[PDB]
Amino acid sequence: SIRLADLAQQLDAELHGDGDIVITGVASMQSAQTGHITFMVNPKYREHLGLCQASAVVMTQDDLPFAKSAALVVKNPYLTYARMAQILDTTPQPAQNIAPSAVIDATAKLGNNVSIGANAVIESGVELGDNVIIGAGCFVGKNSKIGAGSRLWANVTIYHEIQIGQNCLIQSGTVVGADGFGYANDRGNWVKIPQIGRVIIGDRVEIGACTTIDRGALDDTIIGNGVIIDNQCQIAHNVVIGDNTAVAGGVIMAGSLKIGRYCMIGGASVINGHMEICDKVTVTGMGMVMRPITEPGVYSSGIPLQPNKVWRKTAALVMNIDDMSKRLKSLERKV
Amino acid sequence: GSIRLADLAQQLDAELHGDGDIVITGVASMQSAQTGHITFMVNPKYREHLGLCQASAVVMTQDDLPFAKSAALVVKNPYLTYARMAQILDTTPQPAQNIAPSAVIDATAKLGNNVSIGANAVIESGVELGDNVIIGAGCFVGKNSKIGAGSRLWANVTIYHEIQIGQNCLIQSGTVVGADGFGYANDRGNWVKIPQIGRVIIGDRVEIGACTTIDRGALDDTIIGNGVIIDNQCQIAHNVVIGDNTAVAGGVIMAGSLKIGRYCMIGGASVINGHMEICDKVTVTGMGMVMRPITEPGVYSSGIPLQPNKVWRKTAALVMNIDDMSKRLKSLERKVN
Amino acid sequence: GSIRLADLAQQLDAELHGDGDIVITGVASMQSAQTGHITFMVNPKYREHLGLCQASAVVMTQDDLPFAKSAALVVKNPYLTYARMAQILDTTPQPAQNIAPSAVIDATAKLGNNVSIGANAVIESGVELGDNVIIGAGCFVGKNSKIGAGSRLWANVTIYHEIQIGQNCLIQSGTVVGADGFGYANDRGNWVKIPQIGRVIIGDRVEIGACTTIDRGALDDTIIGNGVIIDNQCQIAHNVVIGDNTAVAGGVIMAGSLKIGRYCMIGGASVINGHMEICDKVTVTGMGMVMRPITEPGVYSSGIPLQPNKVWRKTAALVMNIDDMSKRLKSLERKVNQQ
Ligand SMILES: CC1(C)CC(=O)c2c(nc3nn(-c4ccccc4)c(O)c3c2-c2cccs2)C1
Ligand SMILES: CC1(C)CC(=O)c2c(nc3nn(-c4ccccc4)c(O)c3c2-c2cccs2)C1
Ligand SMILES: CC1(C)CC(=O)c2c(nc3nn(-c4ccccc4)c(O)c3c2-c2cccs2)C1
Ligand SMILES: [Mg+2]
Ligand SMILES: [Mg+2]
């Protein structure tokens, strides 16, 4: 719990109402009860703010006239919401202290206040920084290093020789450092290319659940600082992702792709490899990226949904578009 | 477990034609069935082939009966009868039996009657496991989560904190329920984490495949209705709502705050945008690119399917330049008129 | 790990030019290579750059040799030689060594010689592990499953019951082999589970990436042939059959009862529908949408690639209205034909 006056101070918001109100948590506008602080971004929710039963509402100045409760005025309600939710976070830690069922190699190097959950497995030579938390059931492979403040939820797999920076967060089911998909071909038989590169993850990286990030073949797969990656993504060997880029759910990236800084890769996109995407590119969901992207801006692909009866005709016509083109050229020639 | 044919026929509400004392030991395909096996025929084209099936009994319709070359179980719906008899004769093991000494179970967890927990599973404080719940080896169940009676998790399932799972659910290995939704605010180009303090509510009789991820909500909850079936490798984002009885095939990727109605069918590898609604009784065919709300029931499709590469090159180049083609058509139309 | 250059050259069937007594400690990229490293050159545009490479030896072709600024191993196939020398000098650790005290192993399991089982792995009753099999930490191997000699599972792999895996396979972490196929009957709108009592049969020398799922069959079996390579995040549905030496890149989804032949190459993020067959020696390029059987070898493709969003908006609008474009074209043809 926190006093509304103290919360507004920490949030650099200006308070309009009883600063002695006690805030115990954050809630949506529709669910907020007494003690909750909430927020609004869309002006449509103005007309019925009197129906919201939160103790306080984070809003802008243009919103204040419509307020029907204590209000914290800020320039950016959504960012203030992020900050106040961190202050009022109820999320537990993946582990507390080192569990007696954890299996930790005697050559592991552990900092202070490291927590390791039940049945986690820590291999030889692993370095865990101060305040690192390893969840139940994780595996951390030989000589990997995890920087101070980083946290793995339950059942994360880190392979060997992996480097992870400070204050990262990796959700369950994710695998960092599996072999890249590298094979030579000897007369039709695949010949494995050992993948002896690594994965380097920077600081403040968040990776979702059941995402896979392969190690490089010789040099490294690199995730920049401040990158956020959603669930179900595949980051192939020797991919390089620039700082602060965001990758939404289910994105598949091929080997040796380079993505710049401040990019936004939409859900379920497919990005081919051995090419570069420049800074400040947005690919919208399901984008089929076949060529380098050299200019910033928003890019898209795909023919959207239609009723099935309509789609049948659309697809058949598109598949015969060469014949349509030939007929147009012939008609131009004749006219 | 072996069963007399007459008893199996009674449990299936089938009409027995043949020796009720035949002992059935399992279910098999028509081509693999041997003595002791029961099988089924759904396709009357195989009537002439039944003499090649070595099953001790065959489930079939009344129209099929004159063609039988074995004891027959006559039913109205051979396919449904097959599902029922396979359940009766199921050889699938349980994920665990009893409580393994290597499992780590917080003292405050509440176990119902006849709960089984497999080797090296981890059960956090405040967890409640209903009667007959089975947790597979190596699972994690997070703080205060509740799993209803008869639900079963295979090995290596991850349930986060404050998750509610109904009765008689089944969750395959590698699945993660309740990870953080993809919630971040942007501050001058830096991403600022939004704690995801909502939950996941999973209803009764829900089946979830392997390596599927269902994220918790930001403030309110991600909700999966009763009787929903979800295949492998699906992504259900934070604050998605999936209505009762909907089926989601493999590899479907859903964005945040999507609401899918009841009785929908979402084909494999579809991609569904967020902050929008799909009404009841909608079918999206495979690889559907769902970018806008769907407000009428029925069948919807997208995608330009495969062609020989030489042909595809022309299709793709012409589509990409279709604006020029459209302009040329208009210009030719004006010249002719 | 260290090996004299002359000995390495002999094991590679390479021709040594330079000091055979050089001690090679590992493999590196041309850009990263330092003393003790061996590297390779596949692209002759780097001949002028070899003086910037500080490897102790470089694998190259006879045509490259005049450009060398180091000991050289001359071979016909630098890329294949690299694969072989990377295997000889492999630094990849094993998933486990010996049998960990924290592993839980059913008394009825049968182990071959020199089996290793990692910490907190769980082995069910009736499992058979062949000689030199390695089971990583935290794995689960379900009842009666059999893993052939030399096969290795990395950490946190799940093998269900009644699964058969061949020799010298390799499965990366997070993968699930033998989960229930997506099988349901329907009773008045209620899904009725169909127990999936078939199996998965995986052949010899199969490599499977991370977080891939391969479901068991409904009655008969899901089958992966010998020498198949499957990348990460793939989905192989119940009763799929994949022929020998086929490669499947990352994120491919295959629906039930698909049959893929031998020597196929399935590009990343492709979607392959089921109850159909793809013949031998078919290449599906990335993101391919396969709706019909493929009966002739060769290369097949689908998809409309990326455009700037403002351009894409117009493209999508025109395509969605392509039927009207077709009707206008036919009408203009009748006019030009004087009808
Ligand atoms: C990173 C952020 C804070 C902001 C953001 O821009 C974003 C976010 N979540 C998304 N989910 N999906 C998605 C998921 C599944 C299917 C389809 C789409 C996107 O495409 C998402 C995007 C993007 C839009 C355009 C480029 S990235 C949250
Ligand atoms: C649930 C059910 C008993 C019936 C059903 O409706 C269904 C089933 N299995 C499927 N597999 N795939 C699939 C998987 C991967 C790639 C491509 C396709 C579908 O699209 C499937 C569908 C659906 C078709 C259209 C909408 S849902 C079995
Ligand atoms: C097996 C091999 C040594 C050779 C090979 O053929 C191949 C390889 N890696 C790939 N990655 N991706 C990919 C991954 C993610 C997104 C987009 C593309 C492909 O499509 C790949 C392919 C293929 C190309 C065409 C058919 S298979 C490595
Ligand atoms: Mg243990
Ligand atoms: Mg996908």
Side-chain angles (χ1 to χ4, degrees), chain C residues 242-272:
Chain C
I242 301 184
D244 293 353
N245 304 314
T246 283
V248 181
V252 168
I253 300 177
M254 301 176 204
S257 296
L258 169 70
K259 181 176 187 294
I260 304 179
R262 306 178 154 172
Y263 297 107
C264 290
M265 293 163 181
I266 311 301
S270 297
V271 179
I272 310 188

PDB file of all heavy atoms in Angstrom, chain C residues 242-272:
ATOM      1  N   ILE C 242       7.753 -38.951 -43.006  1.00  0.00           N
ATOM      2  CA  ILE C 242       8.785 -38.157 -43.666  1.00  0.00           C
ATOM      3  C   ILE C 242       9.886 -39.078 -44.175  1.00  0.00           C
ATOM      4  O   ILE C 242      10.460 -39.856 -43.402  1.00  0.00           O
ATOM      5  CB  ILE C 242       9.365 -37.081 -42.732  1.00  0.00           C
ATOM      6  CG1 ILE C 242       8.253 -36.143 -42.264  1.00  0.00           C
ATOM      7  CG2 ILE C 242      10.469 -36.300 -43.472  1.00  0.00           C
ATOM      8  CD1 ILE C 242       8.750 -34.972 -41.415  1.00  0.00           C
ATOM      9  N   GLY C 243      10.205 -38.962 -45.468  1.00  0.00           N
ATOM     10  CA  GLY C 243      11.154 -39.870 -46.077  1.00  0.00           C
ATOM     11  C   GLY C 243      12.604 -39.526 -45.775  1.00  0.00           C
ATOM     12  O   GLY C 243      12.933 -38.411 -45.370  1.00  0.00           O
ATOM     13  N   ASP C 244      13.475 -40.517 -46.002  1.00  0.00           N
ATOM     14  CA  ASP C 244      14.890 -40.399 -45.660  1.00  0.00           C
ATOM     15  C   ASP C 244      15.506 -39.140 -46.252  1.00  0.00           C
ATOM     16  O   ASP C 244      15.198 -38.746 -47.379  1.00  0.00           O
ATOM     17  CB  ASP C 244      15.676 -41.614 -46.169  1.00  0.00           C
ATOM     18  CG  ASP C 244      15.298 -42.910 -45.471  1.00  0.00           C
ATOM     19  OD1 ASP C 244      14.523 -42.891 -44.503  1.00  0.00           O
ATOM     20  OD2 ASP C 244      15.785 -43.968 -45.912  1.00  0.00           O
ATOM     21  N   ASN C 245      16.401 -38.526 -45.481  1.00  0.00           N
ATOM     22  CA  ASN C 245      17.279 -37.441 -45.896  1.00  0.00           C
ATOM     23  C   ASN C 245      16.541 -36.151 -46.200  1.00  0.00           C
ATOM     24  O   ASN C 245      17.157 -35.204 -46.693  1.00  0.00           O
ATOM     25  CB  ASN C 245      18.129 -37.842 -47.107  1.00  0.00           C
ATOM     26  CG  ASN C 245      18.931 -39.102 -46.852  1.00  0.00           C
ATOM     27  OD1 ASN C 245      19.559 -39.246 -45.810  1.00  0.00           O
ATOM     28  ND2 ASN C 245      18.889 -40.032 -47.793  1.00  0.00           N
ATOM     29  N   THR C 246      15.254 -36.063 -45.879  1.00  0.00           N
ATOM     30  CA  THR C 246      14.544 -34.811 -46.072  1.00  0.00           C
ATOM     31  C   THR C 246      14.956 -33.798 -45.003  1.00  0.00           C
ATOM     32  O   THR C 246      15.277 -34.155 -43.866  1.00  0.00           O
ATOM     33  CB  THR C 246      13.033 -35.077 -46.080  1.00  0.00           C
ATOM     34  OG1 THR C 246      12.669 -35.633 -47.357  1.00  0.00           O
ATOM     35  CG2 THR C 246      12.236 -33.804 -45.835  1.00  0.00           C
ATOM     36  N   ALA C 247      15.007 -32.528 -45.399  1.00  0.00           N
ATOM     37  CA  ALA C 247      15.301 -31.430 -44.488  1.00  0.00           C
ATOM     38  C   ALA C 247      14.075 -30.544 -44.329  1.00  0.00           C
ATOM     39  O   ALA C 247      13.393 -30.231 -45.310  1.00  0.00           O
ATOM     40  CB  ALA C 247      16.482 -30.584 -44.986  1.00  0.00           C
ATOM     41  N   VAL C 248      13.808 -30.143 -43.088  1.00  0.00           N
ATOM     42  CA  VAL C 248      12.676 -29.289 -42.746  1.00  0.00           C
ATOM     43  C   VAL C 248      13.211 -28.113 -41.939  1.00  0.00           C
ATOM     44  O   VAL C 248      13.709 -28.304 -40.820  1.00  0.00           O
ATOM     45  CB  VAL C 248      11.612 -30.052 -41.939  1.00  0.00           C
ATOM     46  CG1 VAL C 248      10.430 -29.137 -41.616  1.00  0.00           C
ATOM     47  CG2 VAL C 248      11.165 -31.309 -42.673  1.00  0.00           C
ATOM     48  N   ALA C 249      13.099 -26.902 -42.490  1.00  0.00           N
ATOM     49  CA  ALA C 249      13.667 -25.731 -41.836  1.00  0.00           C
ATOM     50  C   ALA C 249      12.728 -25.221 -40.732  1.00  0.00           C
ATOM     51  O   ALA C 249      11.663 -25.787 -40.469  1.00  0.00           O
ATOM     52  CB  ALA C 249      13.979 -24.648 -42.870  1.00  0.00           C
ATOM     53  N   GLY C 250      13.114 -24.119 -40.092  1.00  0.00           N
ATOM     54  CA  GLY C 250      12.455 -23.713 -38.855  1.00  0.00           C
ATOM     55  C   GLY C 250      11.009 -23.279 -39.052  1.00  0.00           C
ATOM     56  O   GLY C 250      10.653 -22.633 -40.042  1.00  0.00           O
ATOM     57  N   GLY C 251      10.170 -23.623 -38.077  1.00  0.00           N
ATOM     58  CA  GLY C 251       8.818 -23.088 -38.035  1.00  0.00           C
ATOM     59  C   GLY C 251       7.836 -23.691 -39.015  1.00  0.00           C
ATOM     60  O   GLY C 251       6.770 -23.110 -39.245  1.00  0.00           O
ATOM     61  N   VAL C 252       8.159 -24.829 -39.603  1.00  0.00           N
ATOM     62  CA  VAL C 252       7.272 -25.484 -40.558  1.00  0.00           C
ATOM     63  C   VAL C 252       6.165 -26.211 -39.808  1.00  0.00           C
ATOM     64  O   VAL C 252       6.417 -26.883 -38.801  1.00  0.00           O
ATOM     65  CB  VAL C 252       8.079 -26.450 -41.443  1.00  0.00           C
ATOM     66  CG1 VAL C 252       7.142 -27.368 -42.237  1.00  0.00           C
ATOM     67  CG2 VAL C 252       9.008 -25.664 -42.385  1.00  0.00           C
ATOM     68  N   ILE C 253       4.931 -26.099 -40.299  1.00  0.00           N
ATOM     69  CA  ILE C 253       3.786 -26.789 -39.717  1.00  0.00           C
ATOM     70  C   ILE C 253       3.273 -27.803 -40.727  1.00  0.00           C
ATOM     71  O   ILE C 253       3.037 -27.464 -41.893  1.00  0.00           O
ATOM     72  CB  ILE C 253       2.673 -25.810 -39.310  1.00  0.00           C
ATOM     73  CG1 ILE C 253       3.189 -24.811 -38.281  1.00  0.00           C
ATOM     74  CG2 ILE C 253       1.474 -26.574 -38.746  1.00  0.00           C
ATOM     75  CD1 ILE C 253       2.168 -23.785 -37.898  1.00  0.00           C
ATOM     76  N   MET C 254       3.120 -29.049 -40.287  1.00  0.00           N
ATOM     77  CA  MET C 254       2.616 -30.125 -41.130  1.00  0.00           C
ATOM     78  C   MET C 254       1.370 -30.720 -40.494  1.00  0.00           C
ATOM     79  O   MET C 254       1.403 -31.136 -39.332  1.00  0.00           O
ATOM     80  CB  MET C 254       3.665 -31.208 -41.315  1.00  0.00           C
ATOM     81  CG  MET C 254       4.937 -30.709 -41.936  1.00  0.00           C
ATOM     82  SD  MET C 254       6.125 -32.040 -41.990  1.00  0.00           S
ATOM     83  CE  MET C 254       7.646 -31.127 -42.030  1.00  0.00           C
ATOM     84  N   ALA C 255       0.284 -30.766 -41.257  1.00  0.00           N
ATOM     85  CA  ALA C 255      -0.982 -31.284 -40.773  1.00  0.00           C
ATOM     86  C   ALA C 255      -1.013 -32.809 -40.864  1.00  0.00           C
ATOM     87  O   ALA C 255      -0.166 -33.441 -41.503  1.00  0.00           O
ATOM     88  CB  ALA C 255      -2.140 -30.672 -41.557  1.00  0.00           C
ATOM     89  N   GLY C 256      -2.038 -33.396 -40.243  1.00  0.00           N
ATOM     90  CA  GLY C 256      -2.059 -34.838 -40.061  1.00  0.00           C
ATOM     91  C   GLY C 256      -2.116 -35.606 -41.370  1.00  0.00           C
ATOM     92  O   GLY C 256      -2.727 -35.182 -42.355  1.00  0.00           O
ATOM     93  N   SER C 257      -1.469 -36.770 -41.367  1.00  0.00           N
ATOM     94  CA  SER C 257      -1.506 -37.726 -42.467  1.00  0.00           C
ATOM     95  C   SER C 257      -0.858 -37.192 -43.736  1.00  0.00           C
ATOM     96  O   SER C 257      -1.165 -37.662 -44.833  1.00  0.00           O
ATOM     97  CB  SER C 257      -2.941 -38.177 -42.771  1.00  0.00           C
ATOM     98  OG  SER C 257      -3.482 -38.882 -41.668  1.00  0.00           O
ATOM     99  N   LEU C 258       0.021 -36.206 -43.613  1.00  0.00           N
ATOM    100  CA  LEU C 258       0.885 -35.831 -44.719  1.00  0.00           C
ATOM    101  C   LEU C 258       1.971 -36.884 -44.916  1.00  0.00           C
ATOM    102  O   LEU C 258       2.527 -37.417 -43.950  1.00  0.00           O
ATOM    103  CB  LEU C 258       1.520 -34.469 -44.445  1.00  0.00           C
ATOM    104  CG  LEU C 258       2.654 -34.007 -45.347  1.00  0.00           C
ATOM    105  CD1 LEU C 258       2.137 -33.682 -46.751  1.00  0.00           C
ATOM    106  CD2 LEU C 258       3.327 -32.807 -44.720  1.00  0.00           C
ATOM    107  N   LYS C 259       2.281 -37.182 -46.175  1.00  0.00           N
ATOM    108  CA  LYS C 259       3.443 -37.998 -46.506  1.00  0.00           C
ATOM    109  C   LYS C 259       4.385 -37.159 -47.355  1.00  0.00           C
ATOM    110  O   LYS C 259       3.985 -36.651 -48.408  1.00  0.00           O
ATOM    111  CB  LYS C 259       3.032 -39.280 -47.237  1.00  0.00           C
ATOM    112  CG  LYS C 259       4.214 -40.186 -47.596  1.00  0.00           C
ATOM    113  CD  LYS C 259       3.744 -41.494 -48.231  1.00  0.00           C
ATOM    114  CE  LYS C 259       4.899 -42.470 -48.432  1.00  0.00           C
ATOM    115  NZ  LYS C 259       5.879 -41.966 -49.435  1.00  0.00           N
ATOM    116  N   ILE C 260       5.621 -37.000 -46.883  1.00  0.00           N
ATOM    117  CA  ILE C 260       6.687 -36.328 -47.623  1.00  0.00           C
ATOM    118  C   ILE C 260       7.723 -37.369 -48.020  1.00  0.00           C
ATOM    119  O   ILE C 260       8.104 -38.222 -47.208  1.00  0.00           O
ATOM    120  CB  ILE C 260       7.346 -35.201 -46.801  1.00  0.00           C
ATOM    121  CG1 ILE C 260       6.299 -34.191 -46.335  1.00  0.00           C
ATOM    122  CG2 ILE C 260       8.431 -34.495 -47.637  1.00  0.00           C
ATOM    123  CD1 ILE C 260       6.891 -33.060 -45.485  1.00  0.00           C
ATOM    124  N   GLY C 261       8.183 -37.296 -49.264  1.00  0.00           N
ATOM    125  CA  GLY C 261       9.130 -38.266 -49.779  1.00  0.00           C
ATOM    126  C   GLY C 261      10.556 -38.016 -49.320  1.00  0.00           C
ATOM    127  O   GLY C 261      10.820 -37.266 -48.377  1.00  0.00           O
ATOM    128  N   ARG C 262      11.491 -38.666 -50.016  1.00  0.00           N
ATOM    129  CA  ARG C 262      12.911 -38.585 -49.704  1.00  0.00           C
ATOM    130  C   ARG C 262      13.541 -37.366 -50.365  1.00  0.00           C
ATOM    131  O   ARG C 262      13.074 -36.883 -51.398  1.00  0.00           O
ATOM    132  CB  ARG C 262      13.650 -39.841 -50.175  1.00  0.00           C
ATOM    133  CG  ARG C 262      13.073 -41.152 -49.673  1.00  0.00           C
ATOM    134  CD  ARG C 262      13.844 -42.349 -50.237  1.00  0.00           C
ATOM    135  NE  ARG C 262      13.725 -43.497 -49.340  1.00  0.00           N
ATOM    136  CZ  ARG C 262      14.154 -44.725 -49.614  1.00  0.00           C
ATOM    137  NH1 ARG C 262      14.737 -44.985 -50.779  1.00  0.00           N
ATOM    138  NH2 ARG C 262      13.990 -45.695 -48.722  1.00  0.00           N
ATOM    139  N   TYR C 263      14.614 -36.872 -49.750  1.00  0.00           N
ATOM    140  CA  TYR C 263      15.449 -35.832 -50.338  1.00  0.00           C
ATOM    141  C   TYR C 263      14.661 -34.559 -50.617  1.00  0.00           C
ATOM    142  O   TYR C 263      15.001 -33.797 -51.523  1.00  0.00           O
ATOM    143  CB  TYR C 263      16.141 -36.330 -51.619  1.00  0.00           C
ATOM    144  CG  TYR C 263      17.091 -37.481 -51.369  1.00  0.00           C
ATOM    145  CD1 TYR C 263      16.772 -38.775 -51.762  1.00  0.00           C
ATOM    146  CD2 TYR C 263      18.301 -37.272 -50.728  1.00  0.00           C
ATOM    147  CE1 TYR C 263      17.638 -39.827 -51.519  1.00  0.00           C
ATOM    148  CE2 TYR C 263      19.172 -38.313 -50.482  1.00  0.00           C
ATOM    149  CZ  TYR C 263      18.839 -39.583 -50.875  1.00  0.00           C
ATOM    150  OH  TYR C 263      19.717 -40.612 -50.622  1.00  0.00           O
ATOM    151  N   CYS C 264      13.614 -34.304 -49.834  1.00  0.00           N
ATOM    152  CA  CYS C 264      12.875 -33.058 -49.973  1.00  0.00           C
ATOM    153  C   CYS C 264      13.523 -31.965 -49.131  1.00  0.00           C
ATOM    154  O   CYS C 264      14.286 -32.229 -48.204  1.00  0.00           O
ATOM    155  CB  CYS C 264      11.413 -33.249 -49.572  1.00  0.00           C
ATOM    156  SG  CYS C 264      10.492 -34.250 -50.756  1.00  0.00           S
ATOM    157  N   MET C 265      13.217 -30.719 -49.479  1.00  0.00           N
ATOM    158  CA  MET C 265      13.721 -29.557 -48.753  1.00  0.00           C
ATOM    159  C   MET C 265      12.537 -28.633 -48.520  1.00  0.00           C
ATOM    160  O   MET C 265      11.991 -28.069 -49.473  1.00  0.00           O
ATOM    161  CB  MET C 265      14.831 -28.846 -49.534  1.00  0.00           C
ATOM    162  CG  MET C 265      16.123 -29.660 -49.670  1.00  0.00           C
ATOM    163  SD  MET C 265      17.164 -28.986 -50.979  1.00  0.00           S
ATOM    164  CE  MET C 265      18.539 -30.131 -50.916  1.00  0.00           C
ATOM    165  N   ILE C 266      12.120 -28.499 -47.264  1.00  0.00           N
ATOM    166  CA  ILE C 266      10.945 -27.714 -46.922  1.00  0.00           C
ATOM    167  C   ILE C 266      11.419 -26.444 -46.241  1.00  0.00           C
ATOM    168  O   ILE C 266      11.979 -26.496 -45.133  1.00  0.00           O
ATOM    169  CB  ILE C 266       9.979 -28.489 -46.018  1.00  0.00           C
ATOM    170  CG1 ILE C 266       9.706 -29.892 -46.572  1.00  0.00           C
ATOM    171  CG2 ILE C 266       8.688 -27.691 -45.863  1.00  0.00           C
ATOM    172  CD1 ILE C 266       9.097 -29.906 -47.987  1.00  0.00           C
ATOM    173  N   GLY C 267      11.149 -25.296 -46.887  1.00  0.00           N
ATOM    174  CA  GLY C 267      11.672 -24.031 -46.418  1.00  0.00           C
ATOM    175  C   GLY C 267      10.941 -23.493 -45.199  1.00  0.00           C
ATOM    176  O   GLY C 267       9.796 -23.837 -44.919  1.00  0.00           O
ATOM    177  N   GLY C 268      11.622 -22.591 -44.494  1.00  0.00           N
ATOM    178  CA  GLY C 268      11.134 -22.145 -43.196  1.00  0.00           C
ATOM    179  C   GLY C 268       9.742 -21.546 -43.274  1.00  0.00           C
ATOM    180  O   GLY C 268       9.366 -20.903 -44.254  1.00  0.00           O
ATOM    181  N   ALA C 269       8.964 -21.778 -42.215  1.00  0.00           N
ATOM    182  CA  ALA C 269       7.647 -21.181 -42.022  1.00  0.00           C
ATOM    183  C   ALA C 269       6.625 -21.645 -43.055  1.00  0.00           C
ATOM    184  O   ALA C 269       5.559 -21.032 -43.178  1.00  0.00           O
ATOM    185  CB  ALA C 269       7.737 -19.644 -42.011  1.00  0.00           C
ATOM    186  N   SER C 270       6.934 -22.692 -43.827  1.00  0.00           N
ATOM    187  CA  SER C 270       5.947 -23.290 -44.716  1.00  0.00           C
ATOM    188  C   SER C 270       4.826 -23.949 -43.911  1.00  0.00           C
ATOM    189  O   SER C 270       4.986 -24.332 -42.745  1.00  0.00           O
ATOM    190  CB  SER C 270       6.604 -24.316 -45.648  1.00  0.00           C
ATOM    191  OG  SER C 270       7.552 -23.692 -46.505  1.00  0.00           O
ATOM    192  N   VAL C 271       3.667 -24.051 -44.554  1.00  0.00           N
ATOM    193  CA  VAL C 271       2.473 -24.681 -44.010  1.00  0.00           C
ATOM    194  C   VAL C 271       2.054 -25.765 -44.994  1.00  0.00           C
ATOM    195  O   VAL C 271       1.742 -25.468 -46.152  1.00  0.00           O
ATOM    196  CB  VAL C 271       1.340 -23.660 -43.810  1.00  0.00           C
ATOM    197  CG1 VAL C 271       0.093 -24.338 -43.253  1.00  0.00           C
ATOM    198  CG2 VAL C 271       1.788 -22.510 -42.882  1.00  0.00           C
ATOM    199  N   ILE C 272       2.046 -27.016 -44.546  1.00  0.00           N
ATOM    200  CA  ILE C 272       1.770 -28.144 -45.431  1.00  0.00           C
ATOM    201  C   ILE C 272       0.523 -28.854 -44.931  1.00  0.00           C
ATOM    202  O   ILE C 272       0.522 -29.431 -43.835  1.00  0.00           O
ATOM    203  CB  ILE C 272       2.957 -29.111 -45.525  1.00  0.00           C
ATOM    204  CG1 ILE C 272       4.241 -28.335 -45.826  1.00  0.00           C
ATOM    205  CG2 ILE C 272       2.725 -30.126 -46.662  1.00  0.00           C
ATOM    206  CD1 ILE C 272       5.430 -29.210 -46.116  1.00  0.00           C
TER     207      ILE C 272
END
